[PDB]
Every structure is written in C-alpha cells, then in structure tokens.
C-alpha cells in the first residue's frame, strides 16, 4: 500500500486521513474539499458505483 507521505490531488499534499475520491479518467486521488465533493456525495458515489471525473479531466 502507499506510504503515508505520498502526494495526491491538485494541491500535491498527502492523504492525511482526509476524505478523498479517485478519478476514473486519470487515476489520481483528490481531496473532496479540493474538488467540490462532499463526504455525503462520496458515500453515494461509492455505493452506486458511478464514475468520478476530476476537474483536470473535465
């Protein structure tokens, strides 16, 4: 699994136990609060199996 000091997202910062979502087009991980996805939306997207497309990829 990845090390705790790996970098992600548009912000180039670690996971830090923050809510994150993976882009199905570029495979990068994004902090929800960086890209506009609430935890609640994340819960729904995870359960409904729908793709997430990040801002870079839009």
């Amino acid at each position: 699994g990845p090390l705790p000091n790996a970098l992600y997202c548009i912000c180039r910062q670690p996971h830090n136990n923050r809510f994150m979502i993976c882009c199905d087009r570029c495979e990068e991980w994004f902090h929800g609060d960086c890209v506009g996805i609430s935890e609640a939306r994340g819960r729904l997207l995870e359960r409904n199996g729908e793709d997430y497309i990040c801002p870079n990829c839009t």
Partner: peptide, 7 residues
C-alpha cells in the same frame, strides 16, 4: 467511485 473516508 473509489473513496477513502476518514478513519
């Protein structure tokens, strides 16, 4: 979508 939720 794949997510990580605060643990």
């Amino acid at each position: 979508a794949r997510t990580k939720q605060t643990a």
